[PDB]
PDB file of C-alpha atoms and ligand atoms in Angstrom:
ATOM      1  CA  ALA A   1     -21.618  -6.705 -15.055  1.00 34.41           C
ATOM      2  CA  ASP A   2     -18.359  -8.731 -15.095  1.00 33.82           C
ATOM      3  CA  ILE A   3     -15.822  -7.731 -17.737  1.00 30.91           C
ATOM      4  CA  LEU A   4     -14.700 -11.326 -18.314  1.00 27.52           C
ATOM      5  CA  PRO A   5     -16.672 -14.500 -17.519  1.00 25.75           C
ATOM      6  CA  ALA A   6     -14.922 -17.634 -16.290  1.00 30.01           C
ATOM      7  CA  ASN A   7     -12.939 -19.804 -18.703  1.00 31.05           C
ATOM      8  CA  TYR A   8     -12.392 -16.754 -20.913  1.00 29.95           C
ATOM      9  CA  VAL A   9      -8.863 -16.910 -22.415  1.00 29.62           C
ATOM     10  CA  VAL A  10      -6.786 -13.766 -22.917  1.00 27.58           C
ATOM     11  CA  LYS A  11      -4.105 -14.005 -25.680  1.00 26.80           C
ATOM     12  CA  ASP A  12      -4.168 -17.854 -25.683  1.00 24.55           C
ATOM     13  CA  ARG A  13      -2.246 -17.998 -22.360  1.00 24.71           C
ATOM     14  CA  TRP A  14      -4.397 -16.818 -19.445  1.00 24.20           C
ATOM     15  CA  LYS A  15      -7.581 -18.741 -18.611  1.00 23.77           C
ATOM     16  CA  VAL A  16      -9.722 -16.738 -16.194  1.00 23.94           C
ATOM     17  CA  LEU A  17     -10.536 -18.740 -13.034  1.00 21.54           C
ATOM     18  CA  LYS A  18     -12.460 -16.254 -10.927  1.00 25.37           C
ATOM     19  CA  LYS A  19     -13.003 -12.646 -10.047  1.00 23.17           C
ATOM     20  CA  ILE A  20     -11.191 -11.694  -6.835  1.00 19.13           C
ATOM     21  CA  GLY A  21     -11.331  -7.881  -6.872  1.00 19.50           C
ATOM     22  CA  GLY A  22     -13.749  -5.254  -8.139  1.00 19.40           C
ATOM     23  CA  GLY A  23     -14.175  -1.501  -7.793  1.00 18.12           C
ATOM     24  CA  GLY A  24     -15.035   1.676  -9.671  1.00 20.49           C
ATOM     25  CA  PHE A  25     -12.017   1.533 -11.947  1.00 21.40           C
ATOM     26  CA  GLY A  26     -11.336  -2.110 -12.820  1.00 16.59           C
ATOM     27  CA  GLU A  27     -11.844  -5.776 -11.985  1.00 16.14           C
ATOM     28  CA  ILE A  28      -9.112  -8.203 -10.818  1.00 14.07           C
ATOM     29  CA  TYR A  29      -8.969 -11.925 -11.548  1.00 15.07           C
ATOM     30  CA  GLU A  30      -7.152 -15.141 -10.827  1.00 15.94           C
ATOM     31  CA  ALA A  31      -5.957 -16.736 -14.023  1.00 16.96           C
ATOM     32  CA  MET A  32      -4.148 -19.931 -14.813  1.00 17.02           C
ATOM     33  CA  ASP A  33      -1.137 -19.349 -17.053  1.00 17.13           C
ATOM     34  CA  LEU A  34      -1.477 -21.999 -19.755  1.00 14.78           C
ATOM     35  CA  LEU A  35       2.115 -21.570 -20.888  1.00 12.05           C
ATOM     36  CA  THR A  36       3.888 -21.809 -17.506  1.00 10.58           C
ATOM     37  CA  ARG A  37       1.040 -23.426 -15.530  1.00 10.06           C
ATOM     38  CA  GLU A  38       1.349 -21.103 -12.556  1.00 11.78           C
ATOM     39  CA  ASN A  39      -1.566 -18.915 -11.576  1.00 15.27           C
ATOM     40  CA  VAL A  40      -1.483 -15.188 -11.820  1.00 17.56           C
ATOM     41  CA  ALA A  41      -3.196 -11.929 -11.101  1.00 18.84           C
ATOM     42  CA  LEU A  42      -4.915 -10.548 -14.208  1.00 18.50           C
ATOM     43  CA  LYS A  43      -6.190  -6.982 -13.731  1.00 21.25           C
ATOM     44  CA  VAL A  44      -8.474  -5.434 -16.365  1.00 20.44           C
ATOM     45  CA  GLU A  45      -9.899  -2.051 -17.373  1.00 21.24           C
ATOM     46  CA  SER A  46     -12.758  -1.469 -19.778  1.00 21.70           C
ATOM     47  CA  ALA A  47     -11.633  -0.095 -23.140  1.00 21.17           C
ATOM     48  CA  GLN A  48     -14.388   2.524 -23.044  1.00 21.85           C
ATOM     49  CA  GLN A  49     -14.072   3.338 -19.318  1.00 24.18           C
ATOM     50  CA  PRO A  50     -13.429   7.126 -19.025  1.00 24.31           C
ATOM     51  CA  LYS A  51     -10.651   7.042 -16.412  1.00 29.61           C
ATOM     52  CA  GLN A  52      -7.916   5.139 -18.284  1.00 26.92           C
ATOM     53  CA  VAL A  53      -5.999   4.254 -15.120  1.00 29.72           C
ATOM     54  CA  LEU A  54      -4.545   0.774 -15.745  1.00 31.48           C
ATOM     55  CA  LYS A  55      -1.971   2.058 -18.261  1.00 30.27           C
ATOM     56  CA  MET A  56      -0.454   4.332 -15.622  1.00 29.08           C
ATOM     57  CA  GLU A  57      -0.530   1.327 -13.237  1.00 28.13           C
ATOM     58  CA  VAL A  58       1.590  -0.594 -15.750  1.00 28.20           C
ATOM     59  CA  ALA A  59       4.216   2.202 -15.969  1.00 26.26           C
ATOM     60  CA  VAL A  60       4.822   2.284 -12.215  1.00 25.52           C
ATOM     61  CA  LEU A  61       4.873  -1.522 -12.221  1.00 25.23           C
ATOM     62  CA  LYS A  62       7.486  -1.494 -15.028  1.00 22.68           C
ATOM     63  CA  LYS A  63       9.761   1.133 -13.404  1.00 23.25           C
ATOM     64  CA  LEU A  64       9.688  -0.998 -10.254  1.00 21.37           C
ATOM     65  CA  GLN A  65      10.771  -4.273 -11.842  1.00 24.10           C
ATOM     66  CA  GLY A  66      14.078  -4.957 -10.096  1.00 26.19           C
ATOM     67  CA  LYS A  67      12.859  -3.830  -6.676  1.00 27.56           C
ATOM     68  CA  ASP A  68      11.658  -6.116  -3.881  1.00 28.38           C
ATOM     69  CA  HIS A  69       8.055  -5.860  -2.583  1.00 29.32           C
ATOM     70  CA  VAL A  70       6.758  -5.577  -6.206  1.00 33.02           C
ATOM     71  CA  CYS A  71       4.876  -8.274  -8.174  1.00 32.53           C
ATOM     72  CA  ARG A  72       6.782  -9.596 -11.182  1.00 32.61           C
ATOM     73  CA  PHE A  73       5.402  -8.034 -14.385  1.00 38.32           C
ATOM     74  CA  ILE A  74       4.236 -10.799 -16.756  1.00 38.32           C
ATOM     75  CA  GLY A  75       2.481  -8.989 -19.592  1.00 44.77           C
ATOM     76  CA  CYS A  76       0.040  -6.277 -20.656  1.00 44.86           C
ATOM     77  CA  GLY A  77      -2.193  -5.761 -23.653  1.00 43.79           C
ATOM     78  CA  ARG A  78      -5.238  -3.932 -24.970  1.00 42.13           C
ATOM     79  CA  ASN A  79      -8.122  -4.876 -27.239  1.00 41.08           C
ATOM     80  CA  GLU A  80     -11.460  -3.377 -28.188  1.00 43.15           C
ATOM     81  CA  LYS A  81     -13.288  -4.524 -25.028  1.00 42.62           C
ATOM     82  CA  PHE A  82     -10.717  -4.140 -22.221  1.00 41.04           C
ATOM     83  CA  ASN A  83      -7.072  -3.360 -21.495  1.00 47.03           C
ATOM     84  CA  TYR A  84      -5.282  -5.966 -19.408  1.00 49.55           C
ATOM     85  CA  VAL A  85      -2.188  -6.386 -17.270  1.00 51.07           C
ATOM     86  CA  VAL A  86      -0.735  -9.694 -16.117  1.00 47.63           C
ATOM     87  CA  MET A  87       1.325 -10.019 -12.942  1.00 44.76           C
ATOM     88  CA  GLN A  88       2.335 -12.411 -10.177  1.00 43.81           C
ATOM     89  CA  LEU A  89      -0.319 -13.463  -7.667  1.00 48.05           C
ATOM     90  CA  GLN A  90       0.214 -12.894  -3.931  1.00 51.46           C
ATOM     91  CA  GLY A  91      -1.150 -14.236  -0.633  1.00 49.76           C
ATOM     92  CA  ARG A  92      -3.306 -13.009   2.229  1.00 46.64           C
ATOM     93  CA  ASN A  93      -3.476  -9.211   2.574  1.00 49.37           C
ATOM     94  CA  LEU A  94      -2.726  -7.424   5.831  1.00 50.81           C
ATOM     95  CA  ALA A  95      -6.283  -6.225   6.555  1.00 49.78           C
ATOM     96  CA  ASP A  96      -7.478  -9.847   6.392  1.00 49.07           C
ATOM     97  CA  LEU A  97      -4.602 -11.179   8.509  1.00 47.40           C
ATOM     98  CA  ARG A  98      -5.119  -8.377  11.071  1.00 50.67           C
ATOM     99  CA  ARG A  99      -8.810  -9.304  11.467  1.00 51.08           C
ATOM    100  CA  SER A 100      -7.784 -12.985  11.879  1.00 50.75           C
ATOM    101  CA  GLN A 101      -5.836 -12.043  15.006  1.00 53.50           C
ATOM    102  CA  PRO A 102      -7.774 -12.801  18.226  1.00 52.90           C
ATOM    103  CA  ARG A 103      -7.556  -9.217  19.442  1.00 51.45           C
ATOM    104  CA  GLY A 104      -7.296  -7.662  15.984  1.00 51.71           C
ATOM    105  CA  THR A 105      -3.677  -6.797  16.841  1.00 49.62           C
ATOM    106  CA  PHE A 106      -0.281  -7.998  15.692  1.00 47.88           C
ATOM    107  CA  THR A 107       2.540  -8.365  18.217  1.00 48.38           C
ATOM    108  CA  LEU A 108       5.161  -5.628  18.209  1.00 49.28           C
ATOM    109  CA  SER A 109       7.425  -8.237  16.556  1.00 46.21           C
ATOM    110  CA  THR A 110       5.260  -8.613  13.484  1.00 48.31           C
ATOM    111  CA  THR A 111       4.307  -4.926  13.395  1.00 49.66           C
ATOM    112  CA  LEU A 112       7.892  -3.668  13.495  1.00 52.97           C
ATOM    113  CA  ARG A 113       8.950  -6.155  10.836  1.00 54.84           C
ATOM    114  CA  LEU A 114       5.996  -5.301   8.561  1.00 51.60           C
ATOM    115  CA  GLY A 115       6.909  -1.659   9.251  1.00 54.21           C
ATOM    116  CA  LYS A 116      10.396  -2.200   7.772  1.00 54.56           C
ATOM    117  CA  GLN A 117       9.077  -3.898   4.633  1.00 51.13           C
ATOM    118  CA  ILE A 118       6.277  -1.446   3.950  1.00 50.83           C
ATOM    119  CA  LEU A 119       8.622   1.524   4.372  1.00 48.63           C
ATOM    120  CA  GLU A 120      10.982   0.054   1.700  1.00 52.03           C
ATOM    121  CA  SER A 121       8.258  -0.261  -0.877  1.00 53.21           C
ATOM    122  CA  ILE A 122       7.255   3.340  -0.110  1.00 50.36           C
ATOM    123  CA  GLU A 123      10.783   4.681  -0.508  1.00 52.06           C
ATOM    124  CA  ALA A 124      11.016   2.385  -3.580  1.00 52.60           C
ATOM    125  CA  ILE A 125       8.065   4.043  -5.298  1.00 51.28           C
ATOM    126  CA  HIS A 126       9.115   7.519  -4.170  1.00 54.48           C
ATOM    127  CA  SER A 127      12.497   6.715  -5.781  1.00 54.60           C
ATOM    128  CA  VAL A 128      10.797   6.332  -9.217  1.00 54.36           C
ATOM    129  CA  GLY A 129       8.914   9.611  -8.874  1.00 55.11           C
ATOM    130  CA  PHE A 130       5.457   8.425  -7.699  1.00 53.61           C
ATOM    131  CA  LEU A 131       3.222   8.760  -4.612  1.00 54.00           C
ATOM    132  CA  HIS A 132       0.981   5.761  -3.715  1.00 54.85           C
ATOM    133  CA  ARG A 133      -1.558   8.059  -1.963  1.00 53.26           C
ATOM    134  CA  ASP A 134      -3.701   5.027  -1.004  1.00 53.97           C
ATOM    135  CA  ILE A 135      -1.656   3.233   1.650  1.00 56.22           C
ATOM    136  CA  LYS A 136      -3.688   0.764   3.695  1.00 56.88           C
ATOM    137  CA  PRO A 137      -3.495  -2.784   5.133  1.00 56.33           C
ATOM    138  CA  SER A 138      -5.685  -4.290   2.410  1.00 53.38           C
ATOM    139  CA  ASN A 139      -3.258  -2.760  -0.104  1.00 53.37           C
ATOM    140  CA  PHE A 140      -0.446  -5.051   1.074  1.00 53.82           C
ATOM    141  CA  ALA A 141      -0.165  -8.815   1.034  1.00 54.39           C
ATOM    142  CA  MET A 142       2.176 -11.660   1.701  1.00 53.18           C
ATOM    143  CA  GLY A 143       3.762 -14.052  -0.739  1.00 54.27           C
ATOM    144  CA  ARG A 144       2.483 -17.561  -1.392  1.00 53.45           C
ATOM    145  CA  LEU A 145       5.784 -19.214  -2.264  1.00 52.68           C
ATOM    146  CA  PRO A 146       8.711 -20.861  -0.495  1.00 54.07           C
ATOM    147  CA  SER A 147      10.712 -17.928  -1.832  1.00 52.29           C
ATOM    148  CA  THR A 148       8.223 -15.203  -0.773  1.00 50.08           C
ATOM    149  CA  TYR A 149       5.955 -16.463   1.975  1.00 49.83           C
ATOM    150  CA  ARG A 150       7.600 -14.170   4.561  1.00 49.33           C
ATOM    151  CA  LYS A 151       7.529 -11.244   2.055  1.00 51.61           C
ATOM    152  CA  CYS A 152       5.040  -8.385   2.232  1.00 53.95           C
ATOM    153  CA  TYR A 153       4.151  -6.733  -1.098  1.00 58.32           C
ATOM    154  CA  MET A 154       2.599  -3.523  -2.437  1.00 60.64           C
ATOM    155  CA  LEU A 155      -0.593  -3.632  -4.517  1.00 60.50           C
ATOM    156  CA  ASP A 156      -2.529  -1.051  -6.544  1.00 59.47           C
ATOM    157  CA  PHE A 157      -1.028   1.962  -8.236  1.00 60.36           C
ATOM    158  CA  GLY A 158      -4.502   3.056  -9.247  1.00 62.66           C
ATOM    159  CA  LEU A 159      -4.408   6.276  -7.272  1.00 60.27           C
ATOM    160  CA  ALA A 160      -0.711   6.877  -7.920  1.00 63.15           C
ATOM    161  CA  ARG A 161       0.553  10.252  -9.178  1.00 65.98           C
ATOM    162  CA  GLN A 162       3.930  11.388 -10.402  1.00 64.98           C
ATOM    163  CA  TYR A 163       5.489  14.189  -8.353  1.00 66.20           C
ATOM    164  CA  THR A 164       8.654  14.657 -10.429  1.00 70.16           C
ATOM    165  CA  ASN A 165       9.178  15.533 -14.088  1.00 70.10           C
ATOM    166  CA  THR A 166      11.110  13.873 -16.953  1.00 70.75           C
ATOM    167  CA  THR A 167      14.397  15.018 -15.391  1.00 68.56           C
ATOM    168  CA  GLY A 168      13.896  14.822 -11.628  1.00 66.75           C
ATOM    169  CA  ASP A 169      12.462  18.089 -10.296  1.00 67.50           C
ATOM    170  CA  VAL A 170       9.410  18.359  -8.055  1.00 68.40           C
ATOM    171  CA  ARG A 171       6.232  19.070 -10.019  1.00 65.80           C
ATOM    172  CA  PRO A 172       4.461  22.175  -8.584  1.00 68.47           C
ATOM    173  CA  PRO A 173       1.564  21.397  -6.275  1.00 69.19           C
ATOM    174  CA  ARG A 174      -2.029  22.174  -7.211  1.00 74.78           C
ATOM    175  CA  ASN A 175      -3.661  24.902  -5.192  1.00 74.69           C
ATOM    176  CA  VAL A 176      -6.348  22.241  -4.586  1.00 72.89           C
ATOM    177  CA  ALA A 177      -6.479  18.480  -5.099  1.00 71.35           C
ATOM    178  CA  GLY A 178      -9.448  16.497  -3.831  1.00 74.19           C
ATOM    179  CA  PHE A 179      -8.702  13.482  -1.663  1.00 72.89           C
ATOM    180  CA  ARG A 180      -9.745  10.349  -3.530  1.00 75.17           C
ATOM    181  CA  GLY A 181      -8.814   7.524  -1.127  1.00 76.51           C
ATOM    182  CA  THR A 182      -9.445   5.679   2.164  1.00 73.65           C
ATOM    183  CA  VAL A 183     -10.207   7.856   5.124  1.00 75.58           C
ATOM    184  CA  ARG A 184      -8.784   5.898   8.075  1.00 74.28           C
ATOM    185  CA  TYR A 185      -5.130   6.287   6.964  1.00 73.12           C
ATOM    186  CA  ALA A 186      -5.457   9.713   5.317  1.00 76.11           C
ATOM    187  CA  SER A 187      -3.169  12.550   6.415  1.00 73.35           C
ATOM    188  CA  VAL A 188      -4.606  15.881   7.510  1.00 72.87           C
ATOM    189  CA  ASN A 189      -3.051  17.221   4.329  1.00 76.44           C
ATOM    190  CA  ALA A 190      -5.472  15.044   2.391  1.00 76.14           C
ATOM    191  CA  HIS A 191      -8.404  15.930   4.608  1.00 76.30           C
ATOM    192  CA  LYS A 192      -7.695  19.619   3.873  1.00 76.35           C
ATOM    193  CA  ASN A 193      -7.783  18.647   0.151  1.00 80.51           C
ATOM    194  CA  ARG A 194      -4.161  19.739  -0.330  1.00 75.78           C
ATOM    195  CA  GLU A 195      -1.803  18.087  -2.807  1.00 72.60           C
ATOM    196  CA  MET A 196      -0.298  14.997  -1.213  1.00 71.98           C
ATOM    197  CA  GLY A 197       3.432  14.460  -0.630  1.00 73.86           C
ATOM    198  CA  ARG A 198       5.776  11.584   0.146  1.00 74.23           C
ATOM    199  CA  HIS A 199       5.174  12.537   3.754  1.00 70.75           C
ATOM    200  CA  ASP A 200       1.496  11.770   3.259  1.00 73.39           C
ATOM    201  CA  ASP A 201       2.332   8.194   2.205  1.00 69.55           C
ATOM    202  CA  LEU A 202       4.280   8.158   5.494  1.00 68.74           C
ATOM    203  CA  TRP A 203       1.431   9.514   7.570  1.00 70.69           C
ATOM    204  CA  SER A 204      -0.554   6.526   6.243  1.00 70.29           C
ATOM    205  CA  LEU A 205       2.228   4.190   7.267  1.00 69.99           C
ATOM    206  CA  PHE A 206       2.235   5.735  10.752  1.00 68.51           C
ATOM    207  CA  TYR A 207      -1.470   5.144  11.365  1.00 69.59           C
ATOM    208  CA  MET A 208      -1.338   1.614   9.909  1.00 69.78           C
ATOM    209  CA  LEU A 209       1.196   0.544  12.546  1.00 68.66           C
ATOM    210  CA  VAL A 210      -0.597   2.206  15.489  1.00 69.81           C
ATOM    211  CA  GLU A 211      -3.640   0.129  14.555  1.00 71.55           C
ATOM    212  CA  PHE A 212      -1.567  -3.087  14.183  1.00 70.81           C
ATOM    213  CA  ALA A 213      -0.189  -2.722  17.682  1.00 68.08           C
ATOM    214  CA  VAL A 214      -2.992  -1.038  19.592  1.00 64.51           C
ATOM    215  CA  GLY A 215      -5.739  -2.809  17.581  1.00 66.84           C
ATOM    216  CA  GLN A 216      -7.916   0.257  16.862  1.00 68.78           C
ATOM    217  CA  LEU A 217      -7.744   3.951  15.962  1.00 66.77           C
ATOM    218  CA  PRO A 218      -9.726   6.774  17.750  1.00 66.62           C
ATOM    219  CA  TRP A 219     -11.980   7.337  14.717  1.00 64.83           C
ATOM    220  CA  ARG A 220     -12.163   3.721  13.420  1.00 67.26           C
ATOM    221  CA  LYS A 221     -15.987   3.806  13.752  1.00 68.53           C
ATOM    222  CA  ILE A 222     -16.650   7.034  11.789  1.00 62.30           C
ATOM    223  CA  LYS A 223     -17.025   7.000   7.973  1.00 62.46           C
ATOM    224  CA  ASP A 224     -17.699  10.728   7.445  1.00 61.11           C
ATOM    225  CA  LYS A 225     -14.555  11.964   5.675  1.00 60.32           C
ATOM    226  CA  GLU A 226     -15.124  15.457   7.099  1.00 60.39           C
ATOM    227  CA  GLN A 227     -15.667  14.351  10.708  1.00 60.83           C
ATOM    228  CA  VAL A 228     -12.603  12.094  10.777  1.00 60.71           C
ATOM    229  CA  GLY A 229     -10.398  14.979   9.629  1.00 61.75           C
ATOM    230  CA  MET A 230     -11.763  17.288  12.346  1.00 59.23           C
ATOM    231  CA  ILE A 231     -10.941  14.649  14.965  1.00 59.87           C
ATOM    232  CA  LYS A 232      -7.476  13.966  13.499  1.00 62.90           C
ATOM    233  CA  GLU A 233      -6.952  17.713  13.222  1.00 66.23           C
ATOM    234  CA  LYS A 234      -7.659  18.114  16.921  1.00 66.27           C
ATOM    235  CA  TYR A 235      -6.179  14.855  18.294  1.00 65.65           C
ATOM    236  CA  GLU A 236      -2.908  14.567  20.198  1.00 65.04           C
ATOM    237  CA  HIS A 237      -0.864  12.140  18.126  1.00 64.98           C
ATOM    238  CA  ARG A 238       1.392  11.395  21.095  1.00 65.02           C
ATOM    239  CA  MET A 239      -1.697   9.813  22.774  1.00 63.12           C
ATOM    240  CA  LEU A 240      -1.450   6.975  20.262  1.00 65.23           C
ATOM    241  CA  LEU A 241       2.157   6.287  21.184  1.00 65.26           C
ATOM    242  CA  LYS A 242       1.302   5.798  24.851  1.00 62.09           C
ATOM    243  CA  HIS A 243       1.449   2.032  24.368  1.00 60.61           C
ATOM    244  CA  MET A 244       3.972   2.238  21.478  1.00 61.60           C
ATOM    245  CA  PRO A 245       7.831   2.320  21.534  1.00 61.15           C
ATOM    246  CA  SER A 246       9.446   5.635  22.489  1.00 59.29           C
ATOM    247  CA  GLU A 247      11.244   5.713  19.113  1.00 60.07           C
ATOM    248  CA  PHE A 248       7.897   6.635  17.487  1.00 58.23           C
ATOM    249  CA  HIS A 249       7.990  10.110  19.071  1.00 60.20           C
ATOM    250  CA  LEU A 250      10.664  10.811  16.456  1.00 61.32           C
ATOM    251  CA  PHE A 251       8.814   9.367  13.464  1.00 57.40           C
ATOM    252  CA  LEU A 252       5.876  11.579  14.491  1.00 60.35           C
ATOM    253  CA  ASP A 253       7.972  14.750  14.971  1.00 60.79           C
ATOM    254  CA  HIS A 254       9.686  14.182  11.623  1.00 61.54           C
ATOM    255  CA  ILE A 255       6.601  13.851   9.466  1.00 59.40           C
ATOM    256  CA  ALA A 256       4.751  16.660  11.299  1.00 63.89           C
ATOM    257  CA  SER A 257       7.727  18.764  10.189  1.00 65.19           C
ATOM    258  CA  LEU A 258       7.515  18.029   6.439  1.00 67.45           C
ATOM    259  CA  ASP A 259       5.755  19.675   3.479  1.00 69.89           C
ATOM    260  CA  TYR A 260       5.139  18.612  -0.167  1.00 68.83           C
ATOM    261  CA  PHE A 261       8.675  19.549  -1.244  1.00 64.52           C
ATOM    262  CA  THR A 262      10.945  18.476   1.590  1.00 62.97           C
ATOM    263  CA  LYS A 263      12.238  14.953   1.011  1.00 64.11           C
ATOM    264  CA  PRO A 264      11.676  12.532   3.930  1.00 63.87           C
ATOM    265  CA  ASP A 265      14.517  10.912   5.897  1.00 64.35           C
ATOM    266  CA  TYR A 266      13.800   7.258   5.161  1.00 62.78           C
ATOM    267  CA  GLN A 267      16.777   6.022   7.178  1.00 65.26           C
ATOM    268  CA  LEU A 268      15.556   7.740  10.336  1.00 63.89           C
ATOM    269  CA  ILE A 269      12.221   5.940  10.109  1.00 63.31           C
ATOM    270  CA  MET A 270      13.973   2.678   9.254  1.00 62.17           C
ATOM    271  CA  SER A 271      15.868   3.098  12.598  1.00 62.53           C
ATOM    272  CA  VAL A 272      12.837   3.803  14.762  1.00 61.61           C
ATOM    273  CA  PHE A 273      11.947   0.266  13.682  1.00 62.87           C
ATOM    274  CA  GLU A 274      15.361  -1.395  13.963  1.00 61.50           C
ATOM    275  CA  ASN A 275      16.153   0.284  17.317  1.00 63.00           C
ATOM    276  CA  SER A 276      12.780  -0.546  18.837  1.00 62.11           C
ATOM    277  CA  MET A 277      13.232  -4.068  17.479  1.00 57.67           C
ATOM    278  CA  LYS A 278      16.615  -4.229  19.295  1.00 57.86           C
ATOM    279  CA  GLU A 279      15.498  -2.802  22.649  1.00 57.23           C
ATOM    280  CA  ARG A 280      13.147  -5.824  22.648  1.00 53.90           C
ATOM    281  CA  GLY A 281      15.249  -8.789  21.493  1.00 58.31           C
ATOM    282  CA  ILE A 282      13.231  -9.000  18.256  1.00 54.10           C
ATOM    283  CA  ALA A 283      14.949 -10.808  15.367  1.00 52.72           C
ATOM    284  CA  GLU A 284      14.009 -10.753  11.679  1.00 50.06           C
ATOM    285  CA  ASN A 285      14.192 -14.569  11.647  1.00 50.26           C
ATOM    286  CA  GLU A 286      11.221 -14.453  14.049  1.00 50.74           C
ATOM    287  CA  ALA A 287       7.904 -15.971  13.035  1.00 51.90           C
ATOM    288  CA  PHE A 288       4.908 -13.814  12.186  1.00 52.86           C
ATOM    289  CA  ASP A 289       1.661 -13.889  14.200  1.00 49.85           C
ATOM    290  CA  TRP A 290      -0.213 -15.872  11.536  1.00 52.49           C
ATOM    291  CA  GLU A 291       2.590 -18.459  11.257  1.00 54.08           C
ATOM    292  CA  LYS A 292       1.957 -21.709  13.135  1.00 55.88           C
ATOM    293  CA  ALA A 293       5.596 -21.929  14.302  1.00 53.35           C
TER     294      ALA A 293
HETATM  295  C1  LIG B   1       0.759  -9.116  -7.192  1.00 52.76           C
HETATM  296  C2  LIG B   1      -0.541  -8.542  -6.974  1.00 52.76           C
HETATM  297  C3  LIG B   1      -1.580  -9.098  -6.058  1.00 52.76           C
HETATM  298  O1  LIG B   1      -1.399 -10.163  -5.464  1.00 52.76           O
HETATM  299  N1  LIG B   1      -2.721  -8.358  -5.918  1.00 52.76           N
HETATM  300  C4  LIG B   1      -3.319  -7.638  -6.993  1.00 52.76           C
HETATM  301  C5  LIG B   1      -3.146  -8.510  -8.068  1.00 52.76           C
HETATM  302  C6  LIG B   1      -3.630  -8.212  -9.318  1.00 52.76           C
HETATM  303  C7  LIG B   1      -4.287  -7.043  -9.530  1.00 52.76           C
HETATM  304  C8  LIG B   1      -4.475  -6.164  -8.489  1.00 52.76           C
HETATM  305  C9  LIG B   1      -3.994  -6.404  -7.198  1.00 52.76           C
HETATM  306  C10 LIG B   1      -4.558  -5.163  -6.562  1.00 52.76           C
HETATM  307  C11 LIG B   1      -4.441  -3.922  -7.296  1.00 52.76           C
HETATM  308  N2  LIG B   1      -4.988  -2.769  -6.954  1.00 52.76           N
HETATM  309  C12 LIG B   1      -5.744  -2.800  -5.846  1.00 52.76           C
HETATM  310  N3  LIG B   1      -6.396  -1.721  -5.308  1.00 52.76           N
HETATM  311  C13 LIG B   1      -7.073  -2.148  -4.192  1.00 52.76           C
HETATM  312  C14 LIG B   1      -6.852  -3.486  -3.981  1.00 52.76           C
HETATM  313  C15 LIG B   1      -5.998  -3.943  -5.041  1.00 52.76           C
HETATM  314  C16 LIG B   1      -5.413  -5.153  -5.446  1.00 52.76           C
END
């Protein structure tokens, strides 16, 4: 049930090499560019598929050309079997690198640095009027190039939603909106099936880091969406920060004090990182855990 078989050629330029991603709403593929000879990420959506998501993916991707932490947009096109998008290919994702770590934990060096780069791409997308809503390790990756290999990127805009309007006002929230994502990094907003904000992409960020440092989350074992929520709804979030820098009592207070509407203070959270980095002699020119330096 693969949309393209190998050695298929889209638009006489992109020879499919293998599948690399699947899911409900599309398949992803490594392709050789036959024009420019580099390889590339070709994502594809069935033409008939009900939930025409890819197109909206390609709008976010296009508004974000210019920004860092975004794959270069190569091309898109549709025909009577599948719609396609072409973009730059990236390296190991964070989930996979995190598991590679002996203890399943990054140093605080690598965590705080990742922190800074993930937060930019979040602000970035907020800036062009979209929530990611599905923020997780496996949704970020590293470059594979001299020019990018120490660069962490953002993948998927599948679950993305616009929160503004044509001008720049905040769309009104739905009275309900059913969480459609990954439980482990879901806010309590999402568990309560309330319309997600920019703060909810920042809750996700918060929990991602805690797991990169500490190496686990309280609920990591559970897969019941409802349970997890009830635990997260009852848990003391300061208990996570017991082995984490004291600058993360601010990040937590800040996001616990936001709603849908209220814009987050991105600079504040960018400091919690840069301060904690400083009170620890951590430089950006430091190696990452996976590096063999
Ligand atoms: C530059 C993009 C990259 O390396 N990864 C990628 C490439 C091509 C298509 C998709 C992705 C991607 C998109 N959405 C996703 N949702 C879950 C996982 C992914 C990966």
